[PDB]
Structure formats: structure tokens, C-alpha cells
Amino acid sequence: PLPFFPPLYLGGPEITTENCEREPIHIPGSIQPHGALLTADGHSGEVLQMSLNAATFLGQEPTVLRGQTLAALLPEQWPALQAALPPGCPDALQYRATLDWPAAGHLSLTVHRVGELLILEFEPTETGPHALRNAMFALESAPNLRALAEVATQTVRELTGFDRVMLYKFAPDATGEVIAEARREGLHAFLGHRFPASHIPAQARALYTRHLLRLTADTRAAAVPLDPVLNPQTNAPTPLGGAVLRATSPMHMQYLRNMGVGSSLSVSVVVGGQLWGLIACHHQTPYVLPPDLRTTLESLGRLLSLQVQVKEALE
Amino acid sequence: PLPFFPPLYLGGPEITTENCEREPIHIPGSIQPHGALLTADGHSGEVLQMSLNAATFLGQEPTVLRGQTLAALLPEQWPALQAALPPGCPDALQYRATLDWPAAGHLSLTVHRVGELLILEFEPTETGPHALRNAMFALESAPNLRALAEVATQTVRELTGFDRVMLYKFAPDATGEVIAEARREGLHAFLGHRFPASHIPAQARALYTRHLLRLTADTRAAAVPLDPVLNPQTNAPTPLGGAVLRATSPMHMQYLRNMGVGSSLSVSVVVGGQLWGLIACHHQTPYVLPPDLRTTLESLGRLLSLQVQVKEALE
Ligand SMILES: *C/C=C1/C(=C/c2[nH]c(/C=C3[NH+]=C(/C=C4\NC(=O)C(C=C)=C4C)C(C)=C\3CCC(=O)O)c(CCC(=O)O)c2C)NC(=O)[C@H]1C
Ligand SMILES: *C/C=C1/C(=C/c2[nH]c(/C=C3[NH+]=C(/C=C4\NC(=O)C(C=C)=C4C)C(C)=C\3CCC(=O)O)c(CCC(=O)O)c2C)NC(=O)[C@H]1C
């Protein structure tokens, strides 16, 4: 991947189709507005950054949260959080808990660690695992790779109710082909369609080998900045590749709108450490898939990755 | 597997260590007393058999339930149940729902189909899937088969709190070896111990390739008969291999008591359709693992089966 541009907030250049592989998608300095995000020092728990919308979810102003400790804000979770994510743990490891809040439903908390920084995501949440347990029989009995792909896309559609679910396989030249598709009756088919490599550029493919699920809940929603935008530990951008709330590339969001997609989600299929493909999902309207369903999709992605490796070895 | 004896209730011979591979463990005509079981006609939903304890869980006498329809007893579930388990579906496929009941907690319903018979299990139930999602990173990063086994047993112990969790690998001669073990501090180690094939006889190993989880919740609990004991559709024994509530072999329950085990559970590890091993769990006291945790263990068993196949292929 040819070197990243600075983000727009550090004076970087505008993105065009001539340089899109240089967009620093991992450090947008902003989040999707269906949740809130805090970052905190990994030893002290001092809150270092806050999404500007944090008052809507946490009930205190961003500027008042800044500098407070997670021991003060989350006294019941802090010791567990800190034990679960020790220094040097994988940046994909998550601590999850459910918090009570004044509004309807609960608040889901998801935390991961990058270097000395803890990144906390808060999202409102008002049958999946057992449905997945059941689907494993048909995934196992699938006779070959294409049959497995067909079962996988139908299974994902059943779990999620997404309008369209595709298995998008990368060729060695990074072009893609839709090798299986489950879709709502009425929808035009992408099955068999092939696409240039530019649609999922090299830096995206690299990120997707490390952090295996990403989404855009509402393809017209404006991003919410982090404040301060730079991590004070480093005076540098905050890596958000491990946060589902990370703001999506505006170039990709424009692609999705042009395609008539209101909500998008994909899960990586990783085989021998290489990005083999994506389970790629669309909805016609905005849709926040709940955290527990996302966890189910992650698990299915891992299972599918392994089955692909096993079915491919039959050849 | 050399042919089954009739069960004791059809005049079959007593089991000894000279003939234990002939015990008809799949048709004990009885269940474990921590739940209730009904069987029903697969088209009409007519209740055909009832565990003698059914009044404790369902609030009507076994003899009064007999002949009533699932449309009458479970009006909210029957159409979904019937659609989920059509004639000829795999006998391992499950329909699951949660029912309200007068006592504390809920009643978990699990249904599967064998031939023209639906078998319904009812058990009281008052973090697992996400913990499994997390453990998949360490299972993937395990460098080889033994390391994977070590991670798997620790993971299962963390999910369940079982006193002992072993990976019990079968050799080609059906003898076993404990190749990984996670256990409570203080417990004597079985790591590296080898055991004759007789401890898990051929009919058991065969059943365990078809129905991948089984348990004994309380190794001193008396079984509860089914009434009538024979399925009226067939005038023959009711196959219970697909029911976790199935009564355990008394010979095995005696083995467990002799070993100081109060509760036992295992999950099959199946590779290329062959029984490779078991995740074998013990608790020192009785323990009913909740249905949702069992589902998580099934999912882990499938994942582990695939990882074993992939790690073994590195050789
Ligand atoms: C010049 C840059 C472009 C570009 C950049 C871009 N694309 C992504 C991410 C995705 N693009 C995807 C492509 C498809 N989805 C489809 O449905 C089809 C065809 C039917 C295609 C070809 C997909 C699946 C992704 C992954 C994300 C998702 O699942 O929604 C990114 C990275 C986005 C991010 O994670 O922030 C970027 C920077 N796309 C272009 O088309 C050109 C203009
Ligand atoms: C003559 C017959 C015998 C016999 C029969 C028998 N055994 C089983 C099932 C199991 N036996 C197991 C063996 C072990 N568990 C351990 O912890 C160790 C060693 C540390 C061993 C060797 C296991 C794991 C099972 C599976 C069930 C479970 O997980 O609890 C059956 C079938 C039981 C059923 O499903 O109804 C039978 C009939 N066992 C003997 O020792 C001899 C006397």
C-alpha cells in the first residue's frame, strides 16, 4: 500500500479516483452518529478524547468528561475492563458489557486497546447464536466451495434480514467476483458480476485483514468529530480501525449512495492470513445491526474462513 | 458395532464389562430429571409420549397431556416448530424457543425430528458467544495441534467454570490420550494419561459421530421413564440420541461416580466425518449447564474440529 496521505484535518489532499488508495481511512478523527466513543489512558483510565455527541449517550458534556477516570465513570466495569485488555494484547480483542441508561433499552459498551490507549464504544441496544449453530450442519454438508458460498450467503441473509448478501471473492490481481448471492425478491442480481480492484483499494484490503468487520449504518449520516482530534499521548491521529463506529471513507459512502444502498456491512474471509473475500451486505435503508448479531456474524466469518480452506483443499 | 441388545425394558441382558459395547444407549426409554420430554406426531402434533415427571414442568398430568395437540399446548410455537423441522430434515437440526412459566426463570424448549416423530425437551433456565468470539483469535494464532488443544481446553474451562476440561484424542485402535487439560487448582492431573478403548465403546463412539453433545447433569440422579415407553407410531423404542435429556448409560454413570465426578459433559471433535476426539468435561458436583452455554460449546466444537483439520494439514 503506497504511503498514506495526511487526513483532511492535517491538511491532506482531496481524494479522487486517481489517488484513493492513499486515503487514511483508519484515522478519520470521527465516528458514526448512532454511537459515542471515548478514548482513555490504558493505565490511569483518564479520558483523553470524546466524540462531540457524547452528551446524548453519556449525559455529560464532552469537555466535562475529558480528564475524568474510568474508575469514576464506570466503577463497576473498570477493574474488569483493565484485566481483560492488558498492555500488548491483540488490538482485535474486545471487552464487552451492557450498561443501564435513562432511555429505552440498554447501552452496549465495547472496548479495545491500541498501544497505550483504550477505545470505548457506546451504542444503544433495545436467536442468532442458535441459528448459527443450526446453519453449521448445512455449511459442513455443502459438497464444495461454491455450494458452501451459496449456503453462507443465505444463512447470513436469514440471520440479518439484509436485502442483499454477497460472497465477494478476490482474484490474485485483486479484482472481485460475486460468487454467491442471497437477495430479497425483486432486487437486481449481482451474481457472477466482476469488478475492478479499485473499488476496494489496497489500504482497505490491508485494514480488512487485521480488523475483520466494518459497516456504514446510514450512508447519508454525517460523521461526528473526536475532540481533541489527536491523541494527547502521541500528539498524533487516533487509530480507529478496531472501532465499528469509525467513520467510513466518504468516497465509499458516495459509492454506496450511487448504488442505492442505505446501510452496508462486511465481514472478512481470511485464509492463511490472506484476504480471500468478503461477506458483503447491503440494506436499502439505514440499519444498525445490534452488537450481538455482529458478534454472530464475526463467528460465522471465522467458521466460513475455515470451511473455505477445507473445501478448497479437496481440490 | 456388534448388534445391540434389547433394552432392559424389553427383557435384555444385564450389562457387564464383557458386553458393554452392546448396551442400547440410544433407547433408554427415560430421561434425566432436570427436564421434561414429550414426543409428538410430526404432522398432527398429537402428543404420543410423556416423561413421568412432566407435571412438574408443564402443569398437567402425563396421562392428561397424552393425545393433546401441540397446536393446543403450544399455540404460539406450533406453526414455527412445524416449519422449522419438516419431514426428512437432519435429526440434529433444532427448533428452540423460550417459554414463560409460573416458577422463577423461563422454560427452554428444544425440539428435533426423528422420522415422523418430534421430540420436545423442556428445561428450566434462570457473555458466552462474545467470549467465544474473543477466543477465536488465540485458537487461530495457536502454532500447531497441541497448542490449539491447550487453548481450547482453557477456553472451555473459562466459558463453563467446569472443574476439569480435557481434549481426549482417539488413536486408530480407539484407545484414548488426554492431550490437553485445564483444571482447577488442587485437582490431580490426567494430562498425558492413556486409556483403553473399552471406556468409550464402539456404539458410543458411533452415536457421538451423529449427535455431537451429551451430558450427565447429576451422576446420582435417577432416570425418569417415558410413558408409554414405546413409540405408538412404530410400537418400537423411541430414539433419544438427539435429546440432551436422554438418560445416560448406568455403566458410565457408575464410572463417573467412581472417578469422583458429579457432572459430566462432552462435545465431539469430528474430522472428515470421523470421531477424532472429545472435549471432555467434569464437575465435582451436579451442574446443569444452561442451554445457551451448551449452544456455545457446540459452536466451539465445530470451530475446533475445523482448526484441527487445518493445523494437522500443516504436517
Ligand atoms: C477511489 C476509491 C474508491 C473506493 C474506495 C473505497 N472502497 C471501500 C470499501 C468497500 N468497497 C466495496 C465494494 C463493493 N461493494 C459492492 O456491493 C460491490 C459490488 C456489488 C463492490 C465492488 C466494499 C464491499 C467495501 C467494504 C466496506 C463495506 O462492506 O461497505 C473503502 C473503505 C471504506 C472504509 O472501510 O472506510 C474505500 C476507501 N471505492 C470506489 O468505488 C472507488 C471510487
Ligand atoms: C463396559 C462399559 C464401560 C463404559 C461404557 C460407556 N462409556 C461411555 C461414555 C464415556 N466414557 C468416557 C470416558 C472417560 N472420561 C474420562 O474422564 C476419562 C478419563 C479421564 C475417560 C476414559 C467418556 C468421556 C464418555 C462420554 C460421555 C461423557 O462425556 O460423560 C458410554 C456412553 C454414555 C452415554 O452417552 O450414555 C458407555 C456406555 N465405560 C467404562 O469405563 C466401561 C466400564
Side-chain angles (χ1 to χ4, degrees):
Chain A
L2 300 206
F4 297 114
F5 289 147
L8 297 182
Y9 61 86
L10 295 179
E14 71 183 357
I15 307 303
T16 76
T17 55
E18 280 181 293
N19 62 23
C20 33
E21 79 171 353
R22 310 189 60 182
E23 183 186 349
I25 60 172
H26 61 300
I27 51 164
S30 61
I31 64 161
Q32 301 178 49
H34 65 281
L37 189 144
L38 301 181
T39 74
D41 189 83
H43 184 254
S44 69
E46 176 194 342
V47 171
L48 294 179
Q49 306 165 282
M50 321 69 63
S51 52
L52 287 180
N53 66 346
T56 304
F57 302 83
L58 305 184
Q60 289 188 62
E61 293 294 340
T63 59
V64 162
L65 289 162
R66 197 172 177 176
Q68 291 194 62
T69 63
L70 292 187
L73 294 169
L74 296 172
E76 294 181 345
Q77 292 77 25
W78 168 239
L81 189 160
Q82 188 173 39
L85 300 172
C89 68
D91 62 7
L93 190 65
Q94 289 177 335
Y95 171 78
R96 176 159 296 163
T98 300
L99 313 174
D100 298 338
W101 78 329
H106 307 254
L107 204 55
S108 182
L109 168 63
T110 307
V111 191
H112 70 287
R113 177 191 276 273
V114 180
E116 299 301 336
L117 196 71
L118 295 171
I119 298 174
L120 299 82
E121 299 177 277
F122 299 82
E123 96 171 63
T125 66
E126 51 172 17
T127 72
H130 186 264
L132 178 62
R133 174 271 186 200
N134 275 339
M136 288 171 162
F137 293 85
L139 292 164
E140 177 58 30
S141 73
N144 60 48
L145 180 288
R146 187 175 293 272
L148 170 70
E150 288 180 11
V151 173
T153 54
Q154 180 63 28
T155 297
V156 170
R157 202 167 163 252
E158 290 166 351
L159 289 169
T160 61
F162 270 122
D163 279 322
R164 185 193 304 281
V165 178
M166 296 171 285
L167 191 63
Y168 187 97
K169 184 178 186 322
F170 295 106
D173 69 355
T175 63
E177 183 181 354
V178 178
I179 63 164
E181 176 171 64
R183 66 189 176 270
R184 197 189 74 217
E185 292 67 26
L187 252 45
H188 70 274
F190 284 128
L191 185 59
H193 292 221
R194 294 184 305 273
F195 299 90
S198 62
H199 290 290
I200 315 187
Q203 88 282 34
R205 297 188 310 268
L207 178 57
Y208 298 167
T209 84
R210 299 177 40 234
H211 288 297
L212 309 179
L213 192 152
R214 77 301 308 182
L215 61 87
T216 305
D218 178 348
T219 56
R220 289 187 146 71
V224 179
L226 298 189
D227 178 30
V229 76
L230 305 178
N231 177 3
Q233 297 175 326
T234 56
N235 300 140
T238 301
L240 294 178
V244 282
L245 294 179
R246 177 181 60 82
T248 302
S249 168
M251 282 276 299
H252 179 52
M253 301 178 71
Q254 183 66 69
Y255 178 72
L256 293 172
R257 292 192 298 270
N258 291 346
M259 299 253 296
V261 175
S263 186
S264 189
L265 180 150
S266 59
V267 183
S268 297
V269 181
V270 175
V271 174
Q274 309 299 133
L275 189 63
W276 182 100
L278 299 178
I279 312 178
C281 309
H282 302 160
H283 217 55
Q284 280 190 322
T285 61
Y287 180 13
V288 182
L289 203 65
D292 291 344
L293 195 48
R294 296 197 308 268
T295 301
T296 299
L297 294 186
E298 290 180 280
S299 291
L300 182 153
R302 292 277 197 176
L303 173 80
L304 181 60
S305 292
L306 287 163
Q307 284 284 14
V308 163
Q309 188 171 12
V310 172
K311 306 280 187 214
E312 285 200 331
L314 296 177
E315 299 285 301
Chain B
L2 300 206
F4 297 114
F5 289 147
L8 297 182
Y9 61 86
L10 295 179
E14 71 183 357
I15 307 303
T16 76
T17 55
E18 280 181 293
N19 62 23
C20 33
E21 79 171 353
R22 310 189 60 182
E23 183 186 349
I25 60 172
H26 61 300
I27 51 164
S30 61
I31 64 161
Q32 301 178 49
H34 65 281
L37 189 144
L38 301 181
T39 74
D41 189 83
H43 184 254
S44 69
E46 176 194 342
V47 171
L48 294 179
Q49 306 165 282
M50 321 69 63
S51 52
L52 287 180
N53 66 346
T56 304
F57 302 83
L58 305 184
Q60 289 188 62
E61 293 294 340
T63 59
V64 162
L65 289 162
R66 197 172 177 176
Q68 291 194 62
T69 63
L70 292 187
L73 294 169
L74 296 172
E76 294 181 345
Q77 292 77 25
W78 168 239
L81 189 160
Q82 188 173 39
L85 300 172
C89 68
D91 62 7
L93 190 65
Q94 289 177 335
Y95 171 78
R96 176 159 296 163
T98 300
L99 313 174
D100 298 338
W101 78 329
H106 307 254
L107 204 55
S108 182
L109 168 63
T110 307
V111 191
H112 70 287
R113 177 191 276 273
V114 180
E116 299 301 336
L117 196 71
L118 295 171
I119 298 174
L120 299 82
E121 299 177 277
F122 299 82
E123 96 171 63
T125 66
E126 51 172 17
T127 72
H130 186 264
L132 178 62
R133 174 271 186 200
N134 275 339
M136 288 171 162
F137 293 85
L139 292 164
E140 177 58 30
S141 73
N144 60 48
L145 180 288
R146 187 175 293 272
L148 170 70
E150 288 180 11
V151 173
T153 54
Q154 180 63 28
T155 297
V156 170
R157 202 167 163 252
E158 290 166 351
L159 289 169
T160 61
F162 270 122
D163 279 322
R164 185 193 304 281
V165 178
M166 296 171 285
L167 191 63
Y168 187 97
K169 184 178 186 322
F170 295 106
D173 69 355
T175 63
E177 183 181 354
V178 178
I179 63 164
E181 176 171 64
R183 66 189 176 270
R184 197 189 74 217
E185 292 67 26
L187 252 45
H188 70 274
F190 284 128
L191 185 59
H193 292 221
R194 294 184 305 273
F195 299 90
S198 62
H199 290 290
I200 315 187
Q203 88 282 34
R205 297 188 310 268
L207 178 57
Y208 298 167
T209 84
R210 299 177 40 234
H211 288 297
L212 309 179
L213 192 152
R214 77 301 308 182
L215 61 87
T216 305
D218 178 348
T219 56
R220 289 187 146 71
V224 179
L226 298 189
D227 178 30
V229 76
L230 305 178
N231 177 3
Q233 297 175 326
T234 56
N235 300 140
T238 301
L240 294 178
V244 282
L245 294 179
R246 177 181 60 82
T248 302
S249 168
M251 282 276 299
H252 179 52
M253 301 178 71
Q254 183 66 69
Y255 178 72
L256 293 172
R257 292 192 298 270
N258 291 346
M259 299 253 296
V261 175
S263 186
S264 189
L265 180 150
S266 59
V267 183
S268 297
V269 181
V270 175
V271 174
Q274 309 299 133
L275 189 63
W276 182 100
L278 299 178
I279 312 178
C281 309
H282 302 160
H283 217 55
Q284 280 190 322
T285 61
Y287 180 13
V288 182
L289 203 65
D292 291 344
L293 195 48
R294 296 197 308 268
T295 301
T296 299
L297 294 186
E298 290 180 280
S299 291
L300 182 153
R302 292 277 197 176
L303 173 80
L304 181 60
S305 292
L306 287 163
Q307 284 284 14
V308 163
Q309 188 171 12
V310 172
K311 306 280 187 214
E312 285 200 331
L314 296 177
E315 299 285 301

